[PDB]
Paper text:
We previously identified EilR as a regulatory component of a multidrug efflux system from Enterobacter lignolyticus, a bacterium isolated from the soil of a Puerto Rican rainforest because of its ability to catabolize lignin components. In its native context, EilR regulates expression of EilA, an inner membrane transporter that confers tolerance to imidazolium-based ionic liquids, reagents that enhance the microbial conversion of lignocellulosic biomass to chemicals. EilR belongs to the TetR family of transcription factors, which commonly regulate divergently transcribed adjacent genes. Amino acid residues 1–192 of each monomer form 9 α-helices arranged in two domains: the N-terminal DNA-binding domain consists of residues 1–52, forming three α-helices, and the C-terminal ligand-binding domain comprises residues 53–192, forming six α-helices.
In a similar manner to the EilR-operator complex, we used crystallography to investigate the EilR structure in complex with each of two cationic triarylmethane ligands, malachite green (MG) and the most potent inducer CV. Structural analysis revealed the binding of two ligand molecules per EilR dimer. The ligand-binding site of EilR contains several Glu and Asp residues, a distinctive feature this repressor shares with other transcription factors that recognize small cationic molecules. To demonstrate the specificity of these negatively charged residues for ligand binding, we created Ala substitutions of EilR and examined their ability to de-repress RFP expression via PJExD in the presence of MG and CV. While the Glu90 and Asp175 mutants induced RFP to a similar extent as wild-type EilR, the absence of Asp163 caused a dramatic decrease in expression, suggesting that Asp163 is required for EilR to recognize the positive charge of these inducers. While several of the EilR-inducing dyes, notably methylene blue and malachite green, inhibited growth of E. coli at high concentrations, CV, acridine orange, and pyronin had only minimal effects on growth rate at concentrations required for full induction. Comparison of EilR in its induced and DNA-bound forms showed a significant conformational change around the ligand-binding sites.
Residue numbers in the entry:
A (entry chain B): 4 to 192
B (entry chain A): 5 to 192
Write the structure that this text describes.
């Protein structure tokens, strides 16, 4: 195992620890355990535990973007709705982490940078889908795919920030309804 | 006396909230900003958290009172002003509100208050939407409540991205997006 592959195995272990315990639980001891190596090796391959935490978080969100993706043959409406509000049960720990990364972004510079980067990734996926569906003729763009993507992502972020508070008139069903509706308005004139 | 000193103490809490945020809302500083002894605030407010939360609610209520327009301007302008004004003087209010949304994750009292301010915001948006629909200016393809939730959600999200320093999401871009979604929601 060359150095890149040790760095990599440790990174993946850190991804599991992130999805199982969150940011608080990503101690070098738990990461070293999950990777099956001695802590000293984790310190030798990742000199900043903070940097390791952030990069692992980024990789987790990337994996979330790959897990939510549908087959190319699927309708473009369905694809976009998956990339924004997928109800797939496998995504729970990822979302739970992303949410956390938001909060800790207020008090941790590195986590804030990583969170911004993940927002850019989310946007990239949404734009990709909007462009493909536009070229296919299913979506109707009266604005650029970038702006539309930022507005949809904003809708999801706000509706989630309200969903977590426990308001009854905004529940899972309401969430999906709203997201589908804004998609209809933005791309099906 | 009874409610007037309570009101002066509340005004103190509000000023300290707009000036420093929740962290600086200590009874020792609030009492000084009110010109009273530190114990009287304990006479008037059982829990310090109760004071922080109630004063926050009052701050947001005042924000909404400042953002309400002359009732004769176009309904679109009233709604927008109720949603997304770019006035710098509001940033101390906005700041506080942001702070609240964060502390709601770790403080049930501030959580209750924050929920309450969100419902107030909602009630205002619904008011303007219904009034504009009656006036024939707004065209509703959905209930004013759902439209309100989607618009407020747009504002909250775009704010969350705006605070990160995203260059493509700045003041101007924010305005553009909000205007656009209003156009889609009420002018089909
Ligand atoms: C960090 N951040 C602001 C957020 C991050 C993610 C989410 C998500 C989500 C979508 C619908 C939900 N529903 C159905 C309640 C719950 C979460 C989500 C976003 C994209 C793809 C799949 C799920 C929301 C907010
Ligand atoms: C805590 N929370 C979810 C939020 C609290 C306040 C805001 C606001 C706002 C609107 C536009 C902005 N721009 C132009 C950057 C900045 C703040 C805002 C809300 C209502 C009236 C005026 C401004 C947004 C989110």
């Amino acid at each position: 195992l060359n150095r890149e592959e040790r760095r990599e195995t440790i990174m993946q272990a850190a991804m599991r620890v992130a999805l199982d315990q969150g940011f608080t639980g990503m101690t070098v001891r738990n990461i070293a355990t999950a990777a099956g190596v001695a802590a000293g090796q984790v310190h030798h391959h990742f000199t900043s535990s903070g940097e390791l935490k952030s990069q692992a978080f980024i990789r987790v969100i990337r994996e979330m973007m790959d897990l939510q993706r549908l087959s190319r043959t699927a309708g473009w409406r369905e694809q976009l709705f998956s990339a924004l509000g997928s109800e797939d049960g496998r995504l729970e720990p990822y979302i739970r982490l992303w949410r956390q990364a938001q909060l800790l972004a207020d008090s941790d510079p590195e986590i804030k940078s990583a969170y911004l980067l993940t927002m850019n990734l989310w946007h990239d996926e949404a734009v990709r889908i909007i462009r493909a569906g536009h070229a296919a003729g299913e979506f109707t763009l009266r604005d650029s795919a970038e702006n539309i993507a930022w507005r949809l992502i904003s809708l999801v972020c706000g509706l989630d920030g309200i969903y977590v508070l426990g308001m009854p008139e905004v529940d899972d069903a309401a969430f999906t309804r709203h997201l589908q509706h804004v998609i209809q308005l933005e791309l099906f004139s």
